[model samples]
Target: MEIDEGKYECEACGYIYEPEKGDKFAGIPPGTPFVDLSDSFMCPACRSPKNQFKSIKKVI
Candidate 1:
């Protein structure tokens, strides 16, 4: 799946990472693809590690 084309889900808290909306609470602006996020990016809802994220079915 392409980085900019898919949404991701937080395994710990079930937070959906919508690439078009980004994670506002984490200071991530809209259109920030998951792959473009920093390696240190954490789930805003549960603070889970980036590795805990999994690509899910696209929402767009």
Candidate 2:
């Protein structure tokens, strides 16, 4: 399974992070790429550490 450039998946909880939608819970606006997110940025769904997120390819 290849990973996409702008998408990330939480290793701990399998939460998909989409840059297009951003993370409303973290106050992140849309269009903000994962790389642009602050170090404090975490998985909004599971509250997992940002480092635990892995780049993932977009699935159709």
Candidate 3:
């Protein structure tokens, strides 16, 4: 299964999370569910909270 490629903008700061284009976590696989990520996962944009992320759209 593939993941969405929509631009997730931080409503608090307007920062966009671009496909992690080149970054990778050592032990995590691509398309890991957000709920499966460590609790340490956070919003790199506004640090508002991971729970704040909403699916804005789906990219082709």
Candidate 4:
């Protein structure tokens, strides 16, 4: 899954990081995978740590 077809969410602030629309403030470009994200990458909304993100597969 080059795109991984999934997204990660910051449990703290509930910021969902979509690979198809990687965050602009997070310094991640589009089509970037969650696993490939740098440790320094953080939540653009709440500034949560990377560890707060958890792999959340598509539902339905």
Q: What is the C-alpha RMSD of each candidate to the true structure, in Å?
A: 4.2, 2.9, 5.8, 4.1
| C-alpha lDDT (0 to 100) for residue 10 of candidate 4 | 84
Off by over 4 Å in 4: 1-4, 58-60
Q: Candidate 2's C-alpha lDDT? A: 0.80
Clashing pairs in 4: none
Question: Considering lDDT, which of the candidate structures 1 and 3 is the better prediction for this target?
Answer: 1
lDDT values for all models: 0.81, 0.80, 0.49, 0.77
Q: Write the per-residue lDDT of candidate 2 for residues 1-60, one digit (tens) a residue.
A: 654667888889998777898776678888878888878887888998888888876555
- List, residue by residue over 1-60, the lDDT tens digit for candidate 1: 434355888888988887789778688888887887788999988999888888775435
Better of 2 and 4 by lDDT: 2
Q: How close is candidate 2 to the true structure, as a TM-score?
A: 0.77
lDDT of the structure predicted as candidate 3: 0.49
Cα error, residue 20 of model 2, in Å, equals: 1.1
lDDT of 3 by residue, 1-60 (tens): 235653355566655444443113224445544445455655765676655655456545
Off by over 4 Å in 3: 1-4, 20-40, 58-60
Task: Give the clashing pairs for model 1.
Answer: none
The residue ranges of model 1 lying beyond 4 angstroms of the native Cα positions read 1-4, 58-60
Q: Report the Cα lDDT for residue 56, model 4.
A: 73
